Every structure is written in C-alpha cells, then in structure tokens.
C-alpha cells in the first residue's frame, strides 16, 4: 500500500528556464527530490524563502551563480546553497537536486531573465 518507488516513466517532465525538469512527485514535508538535466543553462534568477536547495552534479561541468557569487561546478561536487541566496547557473549537466523542506513554488521568488547569450556553454 505505501509507495516507495517513483520511475521516470511516471514523472511529470517539462522544459523550466532552460532546464528540463523531472519531477517524480515524492510528497514528504522533510524534502523533495528531483532530477535536472541542463544543456547551457538556466537561464532565470530566483530565490527561495524557506528551502535549501542542494545540486549533486552527476556528470558534465558548469557555474553557479549565487548571490552573483561565481562557483564552479563539476561532475561528483555537491552545490549546497542556503535559503534566500539568489540563484543562477550555466553549464552542461545531469544533476540531482534536493530541495529542503520541501519544493514550494509559493516559496520561491522571480528576480530576472537572464539573455541565453549569457551562457559561455
Ligand atoms: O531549482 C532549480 O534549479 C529549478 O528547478 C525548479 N524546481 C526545482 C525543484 C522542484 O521540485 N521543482 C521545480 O520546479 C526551480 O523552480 C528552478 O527553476
């Protein structure tokens, strides 16, 4: 009766800024756990109120742009950024990201487009 296991398959996928979203729709008030697949960047700087966001990159190479504060980013790091840090990125990567408690779009706050021309990928 519990569910454990949520696939790709039956996630709810779809294009955001640049970066194409998976989210598998886990529901648990602690944390949430999605996949993020980015080809040059995400191209739209925000900030979230409440939740830690925190990347693990996979594999590919980019830079985060938090607080405009640059920082590299490379396969097998871990990018943790508090709450109420602006942020941004460019990059080719396959990443997996923990926001913490969980997502809440009412939490997260638009601050600018960003030109895809920005992004040196
Ligand atoms: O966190 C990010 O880099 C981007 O992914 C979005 N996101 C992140 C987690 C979630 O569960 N749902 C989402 O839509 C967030 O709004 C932003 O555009």
Redesign the pocket.
């Known amino acids: 009766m519990t569910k454990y296991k949520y696939t790709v398959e039956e996630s709810e996928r779809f294009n955001?800024?640049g970066?194409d979203?998976t989210?598998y729709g886990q529901v648990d008030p602690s944390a949430?756990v999605?996949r993020?697949s980015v080809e040059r960047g995400?191209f739209?700087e925000?900030f979230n109120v409440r939740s830690s966001?925190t990347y693990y990159v996979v594999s590919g190479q980019g830079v985060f742009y938090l607080n405009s504060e640059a920082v590299p980013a490379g396969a097998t790091d871990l990018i943790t950024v508090p709450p109420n840090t602006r942020?941004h990125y460019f990059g080719s990567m396959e990443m997996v990201?923990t926001?913490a408690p969980a997502?809440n779009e009412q939490d997260?706050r638009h601050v600018r487009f960003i030109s895809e021309s920005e992004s040196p990928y």
């Open positions: 955001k800024h970066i979203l989210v949430t999605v993020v995400h739209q925000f966001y942020i990201l926001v997502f997260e």
